[PDB]
Design a protein around this nucleic acid. Sequence first.
RNA 1: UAAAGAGUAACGGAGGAGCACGAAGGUUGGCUAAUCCUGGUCGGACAUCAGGAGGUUAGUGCAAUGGCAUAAGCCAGCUUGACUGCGAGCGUGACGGCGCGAGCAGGUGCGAAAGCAGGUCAUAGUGAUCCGGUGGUUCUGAAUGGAAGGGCCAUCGCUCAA
RNA 2: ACUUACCAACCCGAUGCAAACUGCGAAUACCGGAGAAUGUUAUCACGGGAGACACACGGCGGGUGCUAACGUCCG
RNA 3: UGCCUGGCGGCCGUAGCGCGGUGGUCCCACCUGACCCCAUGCCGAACUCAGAAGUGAAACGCCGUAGCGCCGAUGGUAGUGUGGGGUCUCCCCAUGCGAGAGUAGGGAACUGCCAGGCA
Lengths: 157, 76, 177, 136, 116, 47, 50
Amino acid sequence: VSKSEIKRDAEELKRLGAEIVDLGKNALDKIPLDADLRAAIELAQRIKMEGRRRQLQLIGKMLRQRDVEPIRQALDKLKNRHNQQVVLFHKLENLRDRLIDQGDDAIAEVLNLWPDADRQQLRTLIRNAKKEKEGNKPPKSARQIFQYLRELAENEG
Amino acid sequence: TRNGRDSEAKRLGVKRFGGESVLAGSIIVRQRGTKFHAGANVGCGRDHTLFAKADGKVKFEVKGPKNRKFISIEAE
Amino acid sequence: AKLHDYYKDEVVKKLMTEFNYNSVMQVPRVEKITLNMGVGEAIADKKLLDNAAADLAAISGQKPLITKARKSVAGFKIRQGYPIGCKVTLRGERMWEFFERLITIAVPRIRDFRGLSAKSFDGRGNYSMGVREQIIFPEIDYDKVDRVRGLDITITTTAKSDEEGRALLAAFDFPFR
Amino acid sequence: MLQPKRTKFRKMHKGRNRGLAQGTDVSFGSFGLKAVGRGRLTARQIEAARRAMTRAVKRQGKIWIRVFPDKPITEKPLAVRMGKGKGNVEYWVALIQPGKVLYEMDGVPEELAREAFKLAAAKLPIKTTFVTKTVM
Amino acid sequence: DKKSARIRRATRARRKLQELGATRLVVHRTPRHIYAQVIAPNGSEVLVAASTVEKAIAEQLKYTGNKDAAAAVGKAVAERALEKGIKDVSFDRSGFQYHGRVQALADAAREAGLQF
Amino acid sequence: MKKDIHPKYEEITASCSCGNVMKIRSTVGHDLNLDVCSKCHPFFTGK
Amino acid sequence: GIREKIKLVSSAGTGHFYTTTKNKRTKPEKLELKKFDPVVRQHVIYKEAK
RNA sequence: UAAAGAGUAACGGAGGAGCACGAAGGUUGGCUAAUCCUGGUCGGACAUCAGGAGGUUAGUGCAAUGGCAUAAGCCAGCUUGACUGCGAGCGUGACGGCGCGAGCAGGUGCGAAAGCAGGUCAUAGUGAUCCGGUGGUUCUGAAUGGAAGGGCCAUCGCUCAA
RNA sequence: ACUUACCAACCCGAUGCAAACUGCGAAUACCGGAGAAUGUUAUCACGGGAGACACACGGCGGGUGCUAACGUCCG
RNA sequence: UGCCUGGCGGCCGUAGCGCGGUGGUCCCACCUGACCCCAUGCCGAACUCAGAAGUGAAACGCCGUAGCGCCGAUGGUAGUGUGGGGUCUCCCCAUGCGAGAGUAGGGAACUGCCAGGCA
Ligand SMILES: [Zn+2]
């Protein structure tokens, strides 16, 4: 509706692209980014400062022509700034004590709602979780419980 | 309504009038449509820019059953 | 071509004794037969048009043609180039062969028939019908029909007046109105 | 008041009042009023002149109108400098060139025509004259 | 119309050959006998013309208009065009599809030694 | 006429119950059973 | 924007390639197009249209 | 607006573009609509039409304009000339740039051939240089041989949108 | 099927207007050629040096404005 | 070389449209016989064939018809270059160029080459 209205909208997308290049390689693969865009990211930091502007012009160019919300939404989870991400972790730890203290009454909800949960391994993990807590041993396996639930949270496959 | 803007009107129109000699390959008239049709020894450009194909003097003729203005050149 | 012979031996001499035509071939002759078909809703089901073409392929001796939309209209959800109906043109010996099937068996089998129309004329001398329940024809089987359909048959004639069709169909023996 | 319901463009250039007349002679009635001066007629003036003469002529006869507004004009609102687009919609006017007929009359004697046209001539901002239809 | 349809479709070649400024060989079909003419590049005059109507060739054929007889009129017009010195013509479709009795018309001229 | 694109053209012998035997260019099949015909039809009596 | 720029590489062993644009969304199939190649002085097929 | 070469401004009036098309390009062949009359079934103010005054008021991927019957409008087969190196000459701008471009060498597609094809009927669909990726070039390679690096060519590299 | 102090599509004859309409269409301007006469080559190419890139008014044809302006912007 | 017909052109309505008459030995257009040579997103109206039995119905050519379309004066008028003037939003004067529309009138074509048929 206004040429300058598009301008600030496009410029806002430009600084978003400048945030992707300023993000580490290990966390770069987390976002569902296409290979064509991904390949342009690695060349962006290794190019000289003036070429970064051209690369920033590149990154903005084919990022506007496609959908942006899933990329922005996925980036928000990694930054842990989207509201649904932090509450998801709240319920993820809310089912820990619901499961680590009983071990039988909490598995029903997980299997009924999530069909990719390996109940063969989950029961054994709770067996170790009960053993370490009862024997007042350091929680060397409690961390792995959260990783498995977190991994299955976003379709581990 | 946010008006006040116009394009740069490029240089068209009858530009090589009849009775003058031109060298081969020189344009005669730059036109949008086929206001003037190519005639004897005259070629039509991609954008209907009539260009000469041989040396001579340009003459203007109105030929055809539809009274269409044709552009032709004769060897001098 | 038994009607073509019937046209040659009796029809031609009858008309010169009636309208005293100067030229023997000046008398108008049949040119072609038009069978026009239209489904209830083309966009609803394309198989209906395909079945309609199959029915027209059964009634005629040749495969019919599919017609495209003449012009798209935005208010009636019709797009340009979209197949909207089916048709077939018959030429050569096909006029005389198809004409006998119409008047000998097809028209007499029409339910509640009291006479074909005697007013549907364009003003020049070409005579047009639109008939319902094409199932009267024996080629179209009554068990394979999916719905009740119709057919539009028109005659093509070089006649210059509507009154001249009166005489021509009289020679072709249309019963009455 | 008189105005076309639909216009091709919401506003039109100012234009000029140069040139000669076209409708020198009346071709519908026997008597008519012809403009002698040069100026402009608005919708109000046309309505006022027609109303003023209508009260003087009985329904017997016939009345013709030869002037239409056909020309839009706008006015600039208060406390606005030069620019900010063109003016706002206030009213329209018509172009008048001296020599063409304004109103045409028929059906009642000349004496009533003189009285009727005299009453409507004053409310017109231009000097007019009376003419009689001739052969051909 | 029957005649206007072929006239309007053949002027595309007529303008093209006129622009090229080269002689053209034009033929029009008739359901009984076929003509054949050769036109100068100017178009205001002919150079050689030979048809099958002349009785010289109208006695050595079965039917006037046919493929078998088309190779005779085509050869005859080409034979008498050799001494003219033109040595070259340009064929025109003349609004008729290039197949049928028109095949032998051009083939006979090509076989006689005309470069087109 | 183009082959392999049009339906069959087999000769058939049709006959109405009245007794009018005629050969009709049609594609009904092995035989064509009819009940009425152009003749012997009560059209000129009903009107 | 929606269009994706693509490169057409000669099916021969040479590395000479041509540049062009095709909409992958509507035409995801690889192109079967042959164009002149100056290095081999002939006409060669071009493939791998992204 | 713009005053009959070109060009000509304003907070002058109306608008559009940052694409798309591997077909919607080329060749060859073929064809010609809006609107209305009569007749015709579900069918109505289009369904597709049979007969008619109209040869384009229809259409021309999109805003407008100018053109388009030899149709540039419509359909089908083959198709890549939307090719490589060029390109005398002309026009437009102060210039960078941009556009037209006959014709030459090679290899092609169409049709029998004459010939056409260096993109789309045309006019907006775009970005010069510096510096980055790829391939080629033994072009060069700070002692010799390499290598690194640099150069040249094509190429994707801007909301450089001030 | 009848009727009405209501309205009216379309066509016909006449009458106008239109920068964004032209079945028509000037005077001038512009381009080129030929020629007698005149004009300190006043014409063009290149090189050196500049200045300037804030114009106002009047007439003519216009845009805006009320043809309101010692009004603005145009040739 | 005289008349008629056909093809390719000159010019593009004084070149056409409409009405009436005329033409079939010859030159043209419908109409017949239809294994094939040419190929379809659909038949031999309309384009490709091997045939002259009929007809000049439609079309085409020719002649007349001024109903329409069209061309078009002379004068007049609007406009305008140059210079001057006025009561200067617009006009006049001297001179030059001269509209559009309308009227009288014209107009039912002319011409080049070649081929065929009748004298
Ligand atoms: Zn019976």
